[PDB]
Amino acid sequence: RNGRDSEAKRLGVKRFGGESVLAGSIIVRQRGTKFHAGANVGCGRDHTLFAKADGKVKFEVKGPKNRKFISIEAE
Amino acid sequence: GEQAVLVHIYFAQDKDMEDLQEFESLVSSAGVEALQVITGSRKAPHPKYFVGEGKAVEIAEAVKATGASVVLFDHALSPAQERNLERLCECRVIDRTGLILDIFAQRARTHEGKLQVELAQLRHLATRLVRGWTHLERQKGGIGLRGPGETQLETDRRLLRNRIVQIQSRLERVEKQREQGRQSRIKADVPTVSLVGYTNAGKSTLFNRITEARVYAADQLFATLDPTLRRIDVADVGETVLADTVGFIRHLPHDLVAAFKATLQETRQATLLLHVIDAADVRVQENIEAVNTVLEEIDAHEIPTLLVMNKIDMLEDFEPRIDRDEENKPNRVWLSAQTGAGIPQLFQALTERLSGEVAQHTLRLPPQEGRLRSRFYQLQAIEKEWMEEDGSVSLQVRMPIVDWRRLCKQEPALIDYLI
Amino acid sequence: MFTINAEVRKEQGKGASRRLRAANKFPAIIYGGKEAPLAIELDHDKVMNMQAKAEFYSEVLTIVVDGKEIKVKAQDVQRHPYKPKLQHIDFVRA
Amino acid sequence: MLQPKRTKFRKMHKGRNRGLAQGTDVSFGSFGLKAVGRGRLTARQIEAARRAMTRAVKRQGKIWIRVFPDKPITEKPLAVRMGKGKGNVEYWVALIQPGKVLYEMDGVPEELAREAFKLAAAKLPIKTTFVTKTVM
RNA sequence: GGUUCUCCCCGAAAGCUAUUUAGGUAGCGCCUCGUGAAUUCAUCUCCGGGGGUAGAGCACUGUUUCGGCAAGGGGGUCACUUACCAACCCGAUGCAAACUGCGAAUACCGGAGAAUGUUAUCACGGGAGACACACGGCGGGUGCUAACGUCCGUCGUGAAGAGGGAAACAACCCAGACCGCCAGCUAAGGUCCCAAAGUCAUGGUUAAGUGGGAAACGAUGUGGGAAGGCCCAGACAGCCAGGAUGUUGGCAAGCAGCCAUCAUUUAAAGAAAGCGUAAUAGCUCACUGGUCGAGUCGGCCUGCGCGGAAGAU
RNA sequence: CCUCCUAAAGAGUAACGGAGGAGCACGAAGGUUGGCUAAUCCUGGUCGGACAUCAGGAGGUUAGUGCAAUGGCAUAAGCCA
RNA sequence: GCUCAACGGAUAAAAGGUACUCCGGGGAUAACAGGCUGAUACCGCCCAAGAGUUCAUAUCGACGGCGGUGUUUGGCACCUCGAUGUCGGCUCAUCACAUCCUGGGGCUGAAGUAGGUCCCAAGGGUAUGGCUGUUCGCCAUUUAAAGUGGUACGCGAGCUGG
RNA sequence: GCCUGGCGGCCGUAGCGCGGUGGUCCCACCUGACCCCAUGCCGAACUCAGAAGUGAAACGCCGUAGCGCCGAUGGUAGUGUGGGGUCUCCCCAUGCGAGAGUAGGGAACUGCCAGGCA
Ligand SMILES: Nc1nc2c(ncn2[C@@H]2O[C@H](COP(=O)(O)OP(=O)(O)NP(=O)(O)O)[C@@H](O)[C@H]2O)c(=O)[nH]1
Numbered sequence A: 001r002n003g004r005d006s007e008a009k010r011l012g013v014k015r016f017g018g019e020s021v022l023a024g025s026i027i028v029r030q031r032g033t034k035f036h037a038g039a040n041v042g043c044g045r046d047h048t049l050f051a052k053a054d055g056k057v058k059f060e061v062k063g064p065k066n067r068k069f070i071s072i073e074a075e
Numbered sequence B: 001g002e003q004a005v006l007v008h009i010y011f012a013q014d015k016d017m018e019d020l021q022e023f024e025s026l027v028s029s030a031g032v033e034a035l036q037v038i039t040g041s042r043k044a045p046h047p048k049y050f051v052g053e054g055k056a057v058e059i060a061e062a063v064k065a066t067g068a069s070v071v072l073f074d075h076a077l078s079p080a081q082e083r084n085l086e087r088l089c090e091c092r093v094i095d096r097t098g099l100i101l102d103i104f105a106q107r108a109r110t111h112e113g114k115l116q117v118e119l120a121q122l123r124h125l126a127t128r129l130v131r132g133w134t135h136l137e138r139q140k141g142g143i144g145l146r147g148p149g150e151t152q153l154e155t156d157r158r159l160l161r162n163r164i165v166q167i168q169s170r171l172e173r174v175e176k177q178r179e180q181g182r183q184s185r186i187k188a189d190v191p192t193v194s195l196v197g198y199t200n201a202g203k204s205t206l207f208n209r210i211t212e213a214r215v216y217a218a219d220q221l222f223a224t225l226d227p228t229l230r231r232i233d234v235a236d237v238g239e240t241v242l243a244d245t246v247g248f249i250r251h252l253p254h255d256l257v258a259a260f261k262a263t264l265q266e267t268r269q270a271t272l273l274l275h276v277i278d279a280a281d282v283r284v285q286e287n288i289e290a291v292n293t294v295l296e297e298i299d300a301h302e303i304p305t306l307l308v309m310n311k312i313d314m315l316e317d318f319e320p321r322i323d324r325d326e327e328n329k330p331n332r333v334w335l336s337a338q339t340g341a342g343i344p345q346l347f348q349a350l351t352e353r354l355s356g357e358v359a360q361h362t363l364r365l366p367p368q369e370g371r372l373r374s375r376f377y378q379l380q381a382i383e384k385e386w387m388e389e390d391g392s393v394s395l396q397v398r399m400p401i402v403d404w405r406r407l408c409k410q411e412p413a414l415i416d417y418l419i
Numbered sequence C: 001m002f003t004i005n006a007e008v009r010k011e012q013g014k015g016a017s018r019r020l021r022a023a024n025k026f027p028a029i030i031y032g033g034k035e036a037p038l039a040i041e042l043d044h045d046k047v048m049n050m051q052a053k054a055e056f057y058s059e060v061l062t063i064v065v066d067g068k069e070i071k072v073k074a075q076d077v078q079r080h081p082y083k084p085k086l087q088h089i090d091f092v093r094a
Numbered sequence D: 001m002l003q004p005k006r007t008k009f010r011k012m013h014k015g016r017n018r019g020l021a022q023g024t025d026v027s028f029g030s031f032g033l034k035a036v037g038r039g040r041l042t043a044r045q046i047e048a049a050r051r052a053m054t055r056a057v058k059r060q061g062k063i064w065i066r067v068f069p070d071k072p073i074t075e076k077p078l079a080v081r082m083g084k085g086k087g088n089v090e091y092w093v094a095l096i097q098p099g100k101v102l103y104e105m106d107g108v109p110e111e112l113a114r115e116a117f118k119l120a121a122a123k124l125p126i127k128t129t130f131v132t133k134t135v136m
Numbered sequence E: 001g002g003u004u005c006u007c008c009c010c011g012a013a014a015g016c017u018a019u020u021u022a023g024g025u026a027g028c029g030c031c032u033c034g035u036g037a038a039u040u041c042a043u044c045u046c047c048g049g050g051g052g053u054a055g056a057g058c059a060c061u062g063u064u065u066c067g068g069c070a071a072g073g074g075g076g077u078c079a080c081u082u083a084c085c086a087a088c089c090c091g092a093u094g095c096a097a098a099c100u101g102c103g104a105a106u107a108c109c110g111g112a113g114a115a116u117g118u119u120a121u122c123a124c125g126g127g128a129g130a131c132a133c134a135c136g137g138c139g140g141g142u143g144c145u146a147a148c149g150u151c152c153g154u155c156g157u158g159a160a161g162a163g164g165g166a167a168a169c170a171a172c173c174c175a176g177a178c179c180g181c182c183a184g185c186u187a188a189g190g191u192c193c194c195a196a197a198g199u200c201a202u203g204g205u206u207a208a209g210u211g212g213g214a215a216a217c218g219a220u221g222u223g224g225g226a227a228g229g230c231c232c233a234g235a236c237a238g239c240c241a242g243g244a245u246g247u248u249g250g251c252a253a254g255c256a257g258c259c260a261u262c263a264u265u266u267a268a269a270g271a272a273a274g275c276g277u278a279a280u281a282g283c284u285c286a287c288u289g290g291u292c293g294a295g296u297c298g299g300c301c302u303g304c305g306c307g308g309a310a311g312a313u
Numbered sequence F: 001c002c003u004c005c006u007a008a009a010g011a012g013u014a015a016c017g018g019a020g021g022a023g024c025a026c027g028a029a030g031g032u033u034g035g036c037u038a039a040u041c042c043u044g045g046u047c048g049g050a051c052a053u054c055a056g057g058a059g060g061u062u063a064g065u066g067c068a069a070u071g072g073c074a075u076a077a078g079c080c081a
Numbered sequence G: 001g002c003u004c005a006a007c008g009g010a011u012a013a014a015a016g017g018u019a020c021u022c023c024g025g026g027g028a029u030a031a032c033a034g035g036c037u038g039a040u041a042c043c044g045c046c047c048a049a050g051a052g053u054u055c056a057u058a059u060c061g062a063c064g065g066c067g068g069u070g071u072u073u074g075g076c077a078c079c080u081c082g083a084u085g086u087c088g089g090c091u092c093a094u095c096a097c098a099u100c101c102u103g104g105g106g107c108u109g110a111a112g113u114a115g116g117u118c119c120c121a122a123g124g125g126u127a128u129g130g131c132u133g134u135u136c137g138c139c140a141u142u143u144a145a146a147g148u149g150g151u152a153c154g155c156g157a158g159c160u161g162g
Numbered sequence H: 001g002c003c004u005g006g007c008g009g010c011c012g013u014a015g016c017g018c019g020g021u022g023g024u025c026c027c028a029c030c031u032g033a034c035c036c037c038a039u040g041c042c043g044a045a046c047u048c049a050g051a052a053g054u055g056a057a058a059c060g061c062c063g064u065a066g067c068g069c070c071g072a073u074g075g076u077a078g079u080g081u082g083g084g085g086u087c088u089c090c091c092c093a094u095g096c097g098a099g100a101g102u103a104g105g106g107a108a109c110u111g112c113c114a115g116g117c118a
């Protein structure tokens, strides 16, 4: 009765803190907004985080709820 | 202890009918929860299902509607009939003998009881080897070709017979053990009385009251498994062994009776049987017939018997008494368990039952009779005690002839009153 | 009444502590007040027979380290999970 | 025979029984039986030891059972091959690590406690030791 | 199934995906020859990251034990109450692969810097083979923490690898054979003889041929360590003496069982430890002192030994 | 085909391993502007019962999400126009 | 316009028997016997509720615990499919000892005869028939006893062929 | 310098509770409702015209370890590499080293602008 599974989705952080990114590169693929978007980072319809400008990836924790934010710092 | 549909059939034409109330009692003792009790009437059993095709469809519909787990017939049905009922309704089917074996399996706590019950189950299962469904299929071959050399059905029959012989061999070992325990008493001139009878006869509580020794007793069918022996006092012969016994039921399985050969050795070799009967049971004659039938089956009907009608307190306005045969020997006794009525008369009847002496001697000596005190009080007792003139002491005594002879040999026997 | 005699630990860590317990000493710590914590080693059999007494965990103890008497209370004890031994003692100055 | 009344799931993985026991001190009563060894303790074994010690102390004092078997152990029947799905649940065990206090006891003299715990430890499959309450 | 001369260089895989596919075959991964392009790549240091594993914990989801403060139901009154049960909450206590208010070591991604490495990295093109893997270690599912079992991850070796060791022993330990030498040093492993090298030096243990097969458990074997009771108010095992009153306690006398289980004169005696007696008498233990002049008693922690230990040429 | 776990804290990872779902739905259940904030329990109150609506209080997401599970959601992604 | 759902989809279109059988392969893969394991089986021991006329341990021994053998049923697929003849019977045997008889002994709920149980002991001995293809089993009648297992469930280049 | 308002930084050492305190300005409630605007009823809220009252509630400030929060050192668990054992699990060398808990801390800190009072 238990011989079933789904194709793995290859979700996760595709681009880590400090690495250089061209505009449009996916940073993290995620179910739900586990990482939120900050400066120069756009949220996709399936909650993908991508770079809206060429720069360097930066991770931070902000706000009252201590939520994790992805920002791109222009190099 | 699961959900069951119960099945009973009124085979009034022949003596192969069974009591629905007793059947329900056995089921409840097993602990099964009954969701429905189906009744039918037939002339002789249907070979295919043990019931009609219509009634089999009704039991299948009842199982489907009630979500029952098992089906308990009140009758012995063949492996093919069990298979066909299983095919109609996916639920499992339990024969009356299967129910009885399951009850004994739950109740068995001793090594001997477990051995006997597993032997009975092994024989009952060896009867039901009809389906050889296995994944190895038929082994093809020819002359001079490899193979098992025999069929799987024959191999399984071999294995079942071998393990049955193994259980049997350990059972004769248990018989040797119990026979040593018996032989401890037989070398002594032991009187041994076994109280036996139909279940719920109050015989276990009669044992408890007589012996002042706690043994389990309740309103549960087949409460007691394996016997218990206890010393009891009787006026004539002194020390006697009262033995409790596992009860009977109408139509005990023959495999079960054969399995209990080791346990029934007490009743086989009892110097007396106390056939304890529930007077308040409306099927008292049927209980007599069933108990005599099993006694004949184990070939123990030639032993002296004495009937004991218990539960007279349920009979309105009755007092205990003893009914006696034409030879002036007590053949029947009446009594009650809780109220204790009839117990001293049972003791008196037991005194009368076994004995071979009625003469009473009278003894007297000069001052050399402290040894006489010791010896008399040693063998049995002093029956009638007093003194007389000049310091002489005149005893009156009645003890068995073997005690007389051994006392005469031990003593100088200058009293010229005791032989 | 209880006067324990202890040394100051030259080395601290898993390996050093297990070497101490194989050599039949064991580590302990003195903290509390405002002086810096002091990491010491004690003699196992002596302190075990000492703490067998019930008043050990209630009276003011004294510990002799480098010729200095420090007055303490037993705060926590760590015991071997299934042997009658001691792993660590915490002492609070008082 | 102890068993969970209900569970989220019916079959657990085998896992491993590594590490040292938590709950290694006599907390409720005055005396306790502590596990020096490592292994499983089945509900049947726990019941046997409890019955033995409760008979040793003829309805007197109070007894605590600290270990509860909450792990289902499956076994495949005989004449069955490997695979074809995981086996069916047959009994429940409590994983025991060294130091785990199994039983606890109060309201009895120490001699009677020692005798009862010897009779109990004669039923368990792991080496045990007698322990007494300590302060701090 | 078989496939015929030689030497030199490099050198695999037994995986993923797909398939009327599963012992076939195709693309990719891995081999190889060639061309081209940059510190391209590896290792270590530092720096920037995200974890949610091991461990742990019990706020959550569940499971568990005890105690406390107590709703609500139910056997009965015909609203009282309760020897059953009792949710919530509070305190203590554990457990979890599909729990997480915590959380490593490693691994992985990225940047910078030396040194080192026959460019070991990437792309493209010619040619392949291979897609039965095996065992060992570690982390697991399954199985019985069964199998020389099976299925994954990762490393090693065999495969495709000779030499030394493990008696013999693809996969274990040491270690990678271009050729020759009747030269030397070491690795694992060893150094009484077969058989090369210590019948080597120093301090201990064992008496079991343990060494050279095995458990729960049993034991004044033997070595060692830390305490404890007692002893010159004379101890321990030895050697003399008493155990009675009510009372034959009561429901058989202490000694079948059951309940009281307390006094007593007193140096002391349990309404009695088994034996035994029909049972008393009797037996004498517990119970207490005399005489006897150096140690004695018994628990704990540990080294090594003993029993538990029966198979077929 | 989708969710979780096995899966060993990047990805990926097998078994006739452990558990569940899908083969749709909606022109509003989409877009935007404006606004709003749950479950549960406690207390009081007509028919009212342990649980219908109302008033206040504690509580703070123990709710909700069109349909499994996981991860998310208060700027709400939940509710209303 | 697809339950082409066997979902990378043979064709628009398709079910069975072979013991009358065949051919290429594979010990890549079942049945026999061997091998690993030892859940199961058999034997042995630890605790002692209880049974045993009083009485745990004469004789037994529940609830539970730990081993041994390799011996039953199984698990695996390691050898054998360019062949390792299968069950039972006959002839001939051989080892083990967990001993059936005979010998030696402790205990006994051993008065004697006769037994039970345990320990030592493998020298020798260790049924005939009815039924059934039988091994077993039941039965009859014996014996001091009619032991339990290994040996390719010994033994078909020794017989037979139920 | 003190007080208030707006917008930030940081996101519980910053919160929740308990006690006190403030109306000059500011803020708060507050007065009225044809109209601007609104209630799936209600000027409750949104909104408009105002300033009689009170800081009652809200809000800001101050004090209080009741709760939350933070939290060492030492030890422990775990683990990379190398080695060993009595190898279902551990131990030795070396590097990293938790969680829980204890001691203790804790009644936030700060930037721009505007107004009142000095
Ligand atoms: N009214 C009444 N009930 C009695 C009498 N004697 C016995 N009983 C009841 O009947 C039952 C007797 O059970 P039991 O003593 O075990 O008798 P048993 O025949 O030995 N039981 P079994 O044979 O099934 O093991 C108990 O319910 C007892 O209460 C009697 O004289 N009168």
Ligand SMILES: [Mg+2]
Pocket (backbone or CB within 6 Å): B203, B204, B223, B224, B244, B245, B246, B247
């Ligand atoms: Mg009875």
